[PDB]
Structure 1
């Protein structure tokens, strides 16, 4: 108290990073839920399942990088409960993709708020960290999900019998 490493690291930034860690862990859990929805016997879209599982693992990596940042800067990780996702039944491939797009935009907004706080506190290391490892990746993820939503809508998902199947086998395959 303080850490022998701590420098130019505001307590508000430390707290905001703890909040972001929880949100990335929550996102990981939402994608985990989606992954195992798509491997139900009455859904059986294995490539949607693999897509969401990969996204889940990426979110865990994002959480871990923030935990490492907390330690690097001499802050103290404070974990909270990881809330369950809003649904177990994700209804359709299109619905899951739409929910994932909304989740990614919400996480993006949180990251932009974190960056604005880091700017306000004159913490260029934290600003650079978010820019280098988070902001670019979030924009790419949002774009990819937007693309997938568009194709599924155009193809006639969820009601058109062939749309999610063909998307599963071509795009996600």
Structure 2
């Protein structure tokens, strides 16, 4: 059967993908630590979400070795840009990103049809992480975002603080 070698190939792509997002969210994070962006909360958000997607790839690697399979590590590609211009654009990307990262996670459940259903837990949390990202893109826009640097400052404070 290719089912056992198709599915151990999927855990690896996701592991190298859920690790990628880890990188991007980290690159994003310290784009906001820098003095000429200086939105300490934007930093705190992604950096947490960066840990979340690290802890998420780490579960994939423990499911692999449980299911007998083997762990094929690939280069963690550097994100597409290291200057994310704006908060509104950093969100537009992490949205585009958790969506492409969620594209494959789906191909991983329709091809497993486990009785374990192990990952199904982290499939629900990625979806909670998408609506939150859309909600965050919408507010920035109406707030005459993104250019109004005022708008981003208040969102840093009143949305990424509580």
| TM bin (shorter chain) | over 0.9
Q: Of the candidates 1, 10, 17, which is equivalent to residue 23 of structure 1?
A: 17
Structure-to-structure mapping, 1:41-52, within 5 angstroms: 41-52=35-46
1:148 paired to 2:139: no
User: Which has the larger Rg?
Assistant: 1
Q: 1:111·1:134 contact (CA, 8 Å) conserved in 2?
A: no
Find the residue that maps to 2:77 and give its secondary structure: coil
1:124 paired to 2:112: no
- CA deviations 1:116-160 (Å, max 9, x no partner) are 1113xxx332xx1121x2211111000000000001111112211
Q: 1:16·1:114 contact (CA, 8 Å) conserved in 2?
A: yes
Aligned equivalents of 1:38, 1:158: Cα separation in 2: 15
Q: CA RMSD in A?
A: 1.0
Give 1:6's aligned residue: none
Cα drift, residue 50 of structure 1? 0.5
Aligned equivalents of 2:73, 2:81: Cα separation in 1: 23
- CA deviations 1:32-85 (Å, max 9, x no partner) are 000000011100000001101001000100000000001111111110110000
Aligned equivalents of 2:12, 2:149: Cα separation in 1: 44
Question: For structure 1, which runs of at least 5 residues remain unmatched after alignment?
Answer: 1-8
Give 2:72's aligned residue: 78
Aligned equivalents of 2:153, 2:62: Cα separation in 1: 40
Give 2:126's aligned residue: 138
Find the residue that maps to 1:87 and give its secondary structure: coil
Give 2:154's aligned residue: 166
- TM-score, structure 1 as length reference: 0.89
Give 2:109's aligned residue: 115
Aligned equivalents of 1:145, 1:36: Cα separation in 2: 19
Give 2:30's aligned residue: 36
1:14 paired to 2:2: no
Question: For structure 2, which runs of at least 5 residues remain unmatched after alignment?
Answer: none
Give 1:4's aligned residue: none
- In the TM superposition, structure 1's runs of 4+ consecutive aligned residues that sit over 6 Å from their partners are none
